[PDB]
Amino acid sequence: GGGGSMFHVILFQPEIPPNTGNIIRLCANAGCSLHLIEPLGFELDDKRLRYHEYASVRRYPYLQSCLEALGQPRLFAFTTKGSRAFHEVAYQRGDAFLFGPESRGLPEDVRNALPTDRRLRLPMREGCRSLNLSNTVAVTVYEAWRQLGFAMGLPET
Amino acid sequence: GGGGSMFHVILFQPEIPPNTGNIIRLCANAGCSLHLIEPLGFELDDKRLRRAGLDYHEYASVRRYPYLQSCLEALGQPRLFAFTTKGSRAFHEVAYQRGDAFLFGPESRGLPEDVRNALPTDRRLRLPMREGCRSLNLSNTVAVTVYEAWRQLGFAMGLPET
């Protein structure tokens, strides 16, 4: 209902309002909770992407405040610097997924607080541009959701 | 056998440029060609793509057509799947294969009824959703669709398959 959701999506200092808009819609369709680590590059009444599709959007001053509030969930970081392909992991309910901001990496110190096998990467072809952040989150969430059989409800608390 | 990209992504009358900006990056990363059925809701041509920074290898795979049928003929009539909320079959039940083409409707309207029904029922696919939700963003739908099909092919990166 408000944190008993399937996965937790954590955006570290996101910068571009439409991306976060599209991630809110994605988390709604997939039953995930969304968490934003300040500072943000936009305020949360802008540009409404297109009542309460968004009310399930928490913001926090620091990564650690978010993770305390969530109960220290199993955490994976999704970075181009990953040591391991995202699809090799056995995801499970309550896992948290941490993504960096659009125009920069996730800080070195955040990435290195995670075990090596939990710094994950999507298949990035050589010489290519980065993927859009929202598409990255969608692909990550839908792969983890697929491993759970696209389960819709139980529990919906 | 006449497929030199992994998949073919076809946008029917795309309206919102950032969605197509995002899908160009996804197709480049996954090794897919991208085809846009006119009219578009925005400007797109090789000069604009070059002003963005794409060189010949990258924007040669981004092409426009007048009609859906003109596009399919240019591709050799590949197996075609259409991705819609009115689909009958869940998108993850298909066994995809190299050279498959994926058709997506516009942001505002979804595919024309006559386009959707031109396809066999078992190739009208839907993505899973919470009950009573609005569709996913068009570029998220494409990303999610392509990466599931690509996962089935082991994420083969530019493998020299015929």
Distances (CA, A) of B32 to A3, B10, B12, B70, B95: 37, 10, 16, 19, 17
For B46, residues 6+ apart whose C-beta sits below 8 A from its C-beta are B59
Identify the three-state secondary structure at position B20.
helix
Rounded to whole angstroms, the Cα distance separating B3 from B8 reads 9
User: Tokens 């969430």 appear where?
Assistant: A141
Rounded to whole angstroms, the Cα distance separating B54 from B132 reads 40
Calculate the dihedral angle through the C-alpha atoms of B13, B17, B18, B22, rounding to the nearest 10 degrees: 60
Structure tokens at A73: 């969930």
PDB resolution in Å? 2.2
Structure tokens at A133: 């952040």
* Domains annotated on chain B, with CATH: 1-162 (3.40.1280.10)
Interface of B with A in 113-132 (CB under 8 A): 127-131
For B23, residues 6+ apart whose C-beta sits below 8 A from its C-beta are B9, B11, B34, B138, B139, B142, B143
DSSP state of B122: G
Angle (deg, nearest 10), helices B138-152 and B17-30: 10
The number of angstroms, rounded, from the C-alpha of B51 to the middle of its chain's C-alpha atoms is 23
Amino acid residing at A102? E
The number of angstroms, rounded, from the C-alpha of B16 to the middle of its chain's C-alpha atoms is 15
Contact flag B150-A123 (C-beta cutoff 8 Å): yes
Q: Decide if A35 contacts A70 (C-beta within 8 A).
A: yes
What does the DSSP assignment read for chain A?
--S-SS-EEEEES---HHHHHHHHHHHHHHT-EEEEESPPSS-TTSS-----SSSSEEEESSHHHHHHHTTS--EEEE-TT-SEEGGGS---TT-EEEE--SSSPPPHHHHHTS-GGGEEE----TTPPPPPHHHHHHHHHHHHHHHTTT---S---
Going by their DSSP bridges, the two strands B33-37 and B62-65 should be labelled as parallel
Radius of gyration of chain A (CA): 15
Distances (CA, A) of B67 to A137, B37, B117, B147, B154: 33, 6, 16, 27, 33
Q: Is B49 on the interface with A (CB under 8 A)?
A: no
Is A33 assigned a ligand-binding role in the annotation? Answer: no
Identify the three-state secondary structure at position B153.
coil
Rounded to whole angstroms, the Cα distance separating A79 from A86 reads 10
Contact flag A131-B92 (C-beta cutoff 8 Å): no
The number of angstroms, rounded, from the C-alpha of B121 to the middle of its chain's C-alpha atoms is 19
Q: Is B18 on the interface with A (CB under 8 A)?
A: yes
Experimental method: X-ray
Identify the three-state secondary structure at position B5.
coil
Contact flag A125-B31 (C-beta cutoff 8 Å): yes
In this structure, chain A runs to a length of 157
CA atoms within 13 A on the CB side of B150: 29
